[PDB]
Structure 1
Amino acid sequence: IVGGRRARPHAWPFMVSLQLRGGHFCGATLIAPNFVMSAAHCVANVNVRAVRVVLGAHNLSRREPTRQVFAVQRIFENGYDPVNLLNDIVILQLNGSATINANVQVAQLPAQGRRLGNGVQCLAMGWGLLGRNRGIASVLQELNVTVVTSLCRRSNVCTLVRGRQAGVCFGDSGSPLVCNGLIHGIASFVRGGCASGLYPDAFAPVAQFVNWIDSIIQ
Structure 2
Amino acid sequence: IIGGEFTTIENQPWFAAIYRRHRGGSVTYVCGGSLISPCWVISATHCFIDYPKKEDYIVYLGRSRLNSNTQGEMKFEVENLILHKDYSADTLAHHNDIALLKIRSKEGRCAQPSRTIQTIALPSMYNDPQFGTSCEITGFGKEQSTDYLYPEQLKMTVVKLISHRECQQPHYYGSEVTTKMLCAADPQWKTDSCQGDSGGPLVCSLQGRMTLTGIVSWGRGCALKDKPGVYTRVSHFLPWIRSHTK
TM-score for both structures, normalised by structure 1: 0.93
Whether 2:39 is the aligned partner of 1:31: answer no
Q: Deviations over 1:26-81 (max 9, x none)?
A: 00000111110000111101133111011111112223232111111112233212
Instruction: Find the residue that maps to 2:11 and give its secondary structure.
Output: coil
- Residue 81 of structure 1 pairs with residue 109 of structure 2: no
| TM superposition shift of 1:139 | 1.4
Question: 2:20, 2:29 within 8 Å by CA — same for their partners in 1?
Answer: yes
Equivalenced residues, count: 217
1:124 aligned partner: 137
Q: Which residue of 2 aligns with 1:94?
A: 103
AA aligned to 2:136 is: L
Amino acid aligned to 2:55: R
Find the counterpart in structure 1 of residue 55 from structure 2: 49
- What is the root-mean-square deviation in Å for CA atoms of aligned residues? 1.5
Taking a change above 3 Å as real, the CA distance of residues 57 and 5 of structure 1, as seen in their structure-2 partners, is: same
- Looking at structure 2, the residues matched to 91 and 119 of structure 1 have their Cα atoms a distance apart, in angstroms, of 29
| Corresponding residue for residue 112 of structure 1 | 125
The aligned residue for residue 6 of structure 1 is 6
1:159-188 deviations in Å (ceiling 9; x for gaps): 110114221111100000000010001000
Indicate if the aligned counterparts of 2:49 and 2:83 stay in contact, CA closer than 8 A: no
User: What is the TM-score of this pair, normalised by structure 2?
Assistant: 0.83
Is the CA contact (8 Å cut-off) linking 2:45 and 2:97 kept in structure 1? yes
Of 199, 216, 241, the match for 1:187: 216
Does 1:159 pair with 2:184?
yes
Instruction: Structure 1: give runs of 5+ residues left out of the alignment.
Output: none
The letter for the 2-side match of 1:5 is E
Q: Which residue of 1 aligns with 2:175?
A: none
> Which of 206, 209, 214 is the aligned partner of 2:237?
209
Contact 1:32 1:217 in 2 (8 A): no
1:217 aligned partner, one-letter code = T
In percent, how many aligned pairs have the same letter? Answer: 27
Cα deviation, residue 133, structure 1: 2.9
State which structure, 1 or 2, has the greater radius of gyration over its C-alpha atoms: 2
Runs of 4+ residues over 3 Å off in structure 1: none
CA drift of 1:9 comes to: 4.4
Residues 8 and 72 of structure 1, relative CA distance in 2, 3 Å threshold: closer
Counterpart in the other structure of 1:103: 116
